Symmetry: D2
Subunit: 441 residues, 4 copies
């Protein structure tokens, strides 16, 4: 035990069809991958290839059904969590933080939309982010998430390390065990959760505003206890896991094949329930999009300001070839100032295809004035506002949102994140309220 734990490499074949496809996909050019040696990556993949999965097909299929309801406009999608999971914060309080944070948004939003909210946390493997420049502001190789290199500002720590593939799984599966433990404990009781909201509402300086709704919601709660409905849901509370499918070494290693009680056998990425593809890795003929086609998980794709209705439709037809509403989620990150002019044309040409995607709003990644990397709240709310305004007009469904938040209240002073200043626990709850009023009108 020389300052670090030592795991040892492990000394049933794929259907020919899925082997060929998976191999054809990975053969394609891949953006933003790590630059460590394949000989070593091969070893880590081997270790990983027969570890216990983070999630299981049955849950992924159940997600797929819930997502449909969302896609069909009878439910709502709340995806949110850390901007970037760090191995260092992979702790019980942190994980309990983001869950408490995510659930508090769910009750409010659920009462807002007057329909079920699907809860997808950014968690259990959000360990790898993409970057534009390979060298960063200090003259070092960019930090690309704990799965690839280290935050520490020195070249040594920034050297891409294959070991971090395994270390990433260890942490992910351990975080995922707690989230299972938490959601199925009383941590997820509907009213133990709304106590917190009424707490926030008294202590918040900017609580006056929500005093209103937060009361109305408590009456909706106490009312359903009145009509004789015991927590005995009620449905047991479900938080699904997700992260950007970036590191294809990692993502492939965690592929597992289904048995055969759901049509035919097929590949499932069991590093999470749902995964999406980023703006900087969505090349239409790319390996990421190809990989998206091969797995049976629900998949989202980010859509930036240079997105064209034509292209958007190409994604919808490759990623959802069988027309299964909810399989595909089109995540919009335009930026408040553009989102109203850019989105509507994209939405018409898409709806026209007959396919039913989930229109999720990403109000984060769009808006950044760079004060550190500052993001003004009003700008975030504004984008989700416009995002609704677009769907209302065209008569489609504003499917859900994608927020980057945390449990520890962050701002100089409090800059704790290993990436970007986002919304703090407070702001995100406060955003949940504002967005709840948008669902009302």
């Amino acid at each position: 035990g020389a300052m670090n734990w030592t795991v040892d490499i492990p000394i049933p074949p794929l259907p020919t069809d899925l082997r060929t496809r998976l191999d054809a996909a990975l053969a394609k050019p891949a953006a933003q991958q790590p630059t460590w040696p394949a000989d070593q990556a091969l070893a880590m993949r081997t270790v990983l290839e027969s570890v216990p999965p983070v999630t299981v097909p049955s849950e992924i299929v159940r997600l797929q059904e819930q997502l449909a309801q969302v896609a069909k406009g009878e439910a709502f999608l709340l995806q949110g969590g850390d901007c970037a999971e760090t191995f260092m914060d992979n702790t019980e309080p942190h994980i309990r933080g983001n869950v408490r944070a995510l659930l508090q948004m769910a009750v409010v939003l659920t009462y807002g939309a007057s329909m079920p909210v699907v809860k997808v946390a950014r968690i259990a493997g959000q360990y790898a982010k993409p970057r534009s420049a390979d060298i960063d502001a200090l003259g070092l190789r960019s930090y690309r998430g704990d799965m690839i290199n280290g935050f520490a500002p020195d070249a040594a720590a920034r050297e891409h390390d294959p070991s971090r593939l395994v270390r990433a799984y260890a942490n992910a599966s351990a975080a995922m065990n707690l989230v299972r433990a938490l959601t199925s404990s009383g941590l997820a009781s509907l009213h133990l959760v709304h106590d917190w909201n009424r707490e926030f509402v008294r202590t918040s300086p900017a609580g006056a505003r929500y005093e209103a709704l937060a009361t109305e919601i408590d009456r909706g709660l106490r009312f359903m206890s009145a009509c004789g409905v015991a927590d005995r849901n009620l449905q047991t509370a479900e938080i699904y896991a997700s992260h950007e499918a970036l590191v294809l070494d990692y993502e492939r290693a965690m592929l597992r094949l289904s048995d055969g009680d759901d049509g035919e056998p097929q590949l499932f990425d069991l590093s999470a329930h749902t995964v999406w593809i980023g703006e900087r890795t969505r090349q239409i003929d790319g390996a990421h999009i190809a990989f998206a086609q091969v797995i049976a998980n629900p998949v989202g794709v980010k859509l930036g300001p240079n997105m064209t209705p034509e292209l958007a439709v190409e994604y919808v037809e490759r990623l959802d070839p069988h027309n299964k509403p909810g399989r595909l989620t089109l995540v919009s990150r335009m930026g408040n100032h553009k989102v109203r002019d850019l989105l509507p044309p994209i939405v018409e040409k898409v709806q026209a295809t007959g396919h039913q995607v989930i229109w999720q709003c990403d109000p984060m990644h769009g808006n950044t004035h760079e004060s550190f990397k500052t993001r003004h709240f009003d700008r975030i709310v504004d984008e989700v506002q416009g995002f609704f305004e677009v769907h209302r007009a065209l008569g489609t469904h504003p499917g859900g949102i994608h927020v980057e938040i945390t449990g520890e209240n962050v701002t100089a002073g409090r800059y704790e994140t290993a990436c970007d200043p986002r919304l703090n626990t407070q702001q995100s709850l406060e955003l949940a309220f504002l967005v709840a009023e948008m669902l009302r009108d």
Copy 2:
């Protein structure tokens, strides 16, 4: 079949103790009984003594538990229905009217009190009312309900007729079968019921006011459907039956003895679930109050303006000798103008006894200016207002209310009742809203 159906007189003894008691009770002087011959009343009682009961002990015991919660201040009592059931209106639409009417009050009030509402309809035997003068305004023997004589304004019809004891049961048990059928059908689905309220709220000229709450309530509903709670209550909807225990010939004939899975054997009045005793028949040493002591049903007693804290306490100790919270309900009918000064002293001296009664407000019987017999709405609301104001101050629980209403919208013009102009379907729903706001504050 000479213009009328002919039933034929029927050609297991009481425990000595209950025989003696019941006989001692009836031996006492009785106010407001009918003046037909005992030889004939004996015959009707015989017929009745072995007919199928309207209610069964198990339901009465279950009521007793629900009433406790109400008495303990964790539930609310909504008692209401026809002022006076008539054999002529004992029809499917009428009965469906009062139930629809009673349930619509229940959802609103339940959302108001943010706790369960017990639903007791005046029904299935509210066929006998008391009167002050034996001769009435036209020079005829007073009409005392279809169980005793007839509404028709002629001496012939006013002759007290024993047959009406049986005719009263036939109708009661038939009405009670429908109410069972109705509440267990979809007639009692929570949302099929609130559709009506949102209907009333658009069509009502005076709906603006409630547009507010009626919306908030619909969101509380849609919210509990969101959190994944199927009507599959939910508790199946329960409406209990009740009426003024006035005609002791009738009431005794419908006594039945319990088996022995609830302590010892004891007498139950199975003409209804709960019955109360009127202002004009509550003589403390009276036969009605004695009869109240003998049966194991929950019993209410009306309390007029001449009621004294001392007397009130005597009722509480005779009618609730074992301290079973909820057995006894003290119904207040003071009159808005007096209720605030008269009630509070009564409430203190009672609470002081350690017993826990249900404080139900009767805002009807108090207020009558006699334009017909006119009752102004604002005066009714005012009494329930003051009734709350009293309990709030002393810190006790405003237990429930007792309203006299109907399904057909009544006012000259529309005077349809066989007794008093009360609240119409509309006014009573409107009263349910006003009273819902009193529970909120």
Copy 3:
């Protein structure tokens, strides 16, 4: 000592559905009462506006369960008094027959390993046909309390239409009670079997059944250990039924659904399901015409004279829309004749495409007429018909649907005012026996 009791017509039924009804009842009716039309009209008018015994949503739901019964996924269990009398229309008598029925349900539910739809011969069985116009004492035959009285006197035996109203008052009072009982602890699955377990200790025919009687207990206890909400369940929905004989009563009780569902259609709210008897099933008579007009799930008695071709004609009049379970063909041949006579029918009927429910009635078809004056039925002959009834079906791979039984809660052997039958302890014993038939 009797006591006559006195007596505003709401809106009448649609003119269009009425014309159809009229056209229907215009057919000749069999075995009807011989009272004045005028008096009979008055009484119909009373009942035209009373509270109904059942309601439409109940019937529309029964039909749904009857669909599964007919699709070979559930079992029918019809049973109750041979003849309801007004005098026994009491609390212990109904408590009894409800109890006997539920006990049978529990054992057959476990035996068939599928839901048992519980239909009770109750709240309305107050009329019976008579092939004897003058009886054995030389009085006008007794035709049920809905028509005349059992008392062997000329006066009592004269058909009184007020008995229409008296019949209602008792049917609604009786139904008010089964509702109450069935929705309280009287239909608690656990409490219900306790009565069976004690039947196994206290019967001489006990050692035979103790085996299975224990198995059922461990099934019950097994699901308590699994922690399944008592709080079902379905509580124990018991539907009401009777033979639809006196037409004046059944038409007064015709009501129209409100039509927030489907369209507007006639229902007979005197009951949930009704059937039409062996002697009143004339294909072009008023009774089948009636069954056509009403929406209720309907049944027909089939005897030894039945010809598969006619049995088909019923499948086409009654279930023209092919709604599975709408029509239940009840078989009452006789153990000796069941095995030979039934199959040809099944085949011809199954060939129509329609899905009927196949119920067995081993009661009427098996009756000996004892040597001590008292009429009687034999128990083995009864079990046997049900046995053969199953064998017939097993062979053709069709679904033996259920049984129709004339039983009682009181342990009697002759305190009935009609035909003989089984007793509490005998029907329970039968359920056990039909229970083993289901297992194979």
Copy 4:
């Protein structure tokens, strides 16, 4: 080819509870690893702040079910791998042992006619005592993957404290999966018994069990016909357990409840329940001292050398508060010695007032050591102990609580890296046999 993997201490545990802990661990410990204290400290520090394998509300709920187990209303079912290896810490292996366990649960649940609390030997069983300091090949004895490695080489056999962290990573990954599986269709009661029914067709020891195997099916089908919500249920709560041997690991995993319930108390969140082995139960040793400090439901192995007086001393150290089910005394005597040795203990223990759970461990106490080199256990000798274990209890009218079994999903016979045992088909077979013991 291996791969080392690198490594902010949150607030430490209360000073007051720490002093108690210190005082406790100061006692001498048996069968502990011989690594450097410094290195062992580093590793403890890692684990001092990781995510826990269980959480307190889970343990506080298990305790509640264990209270009923001890009050003779439920049954304990402990079972799983003899020794978890890191290399078999795979998806098919855990799917297997979870499956084997649930199958056993179904049969015993029905047999005992009462809830069975399912506790799995999983997610943490990575250490074992050794009465042999040098093994048969002359290498430092293998002491579990948590301590050293199975590979017969000197290097691998040296105690490495990084195995503390590796042990956690696998225990949490493994627990992450049982959660997933147990909350999906893998613990569907119906789907679970399907695997049993097929065991009755495809076993040679089938005709023996088909009887009961059918009964269980009809129990299942009976409750489907009653219309009980699948949607339980409890889904199938499977608790994690292992022998608490390596103390450095168990103390790192000590966490403090947040105290919105009760007071603040120590829990060992490395598992749900843990037990203390025959060789490390020294009354004044560190291992019992540990059991005192932690709140988890605890158990102790009792062998042939046990003296009722000492057994009592356990009842008083461990369950000083008399919380029913807190302490489970496990018996591993031996079929030949169970019947004579156990009773005196029960009596002396029941006499204290305290309510312990009485679990039976017919695994260690029954082992022959075969004549072909391979160590082995005999199956009949195993059933017998459980038999006698029941007889002992029946006689004294005390409650035989449950069994502890070393089993597996894979049908093996010697692919384990530890002691011998039963196989999937053998444990299932045992559950059936213990199932009939419960019925009498």
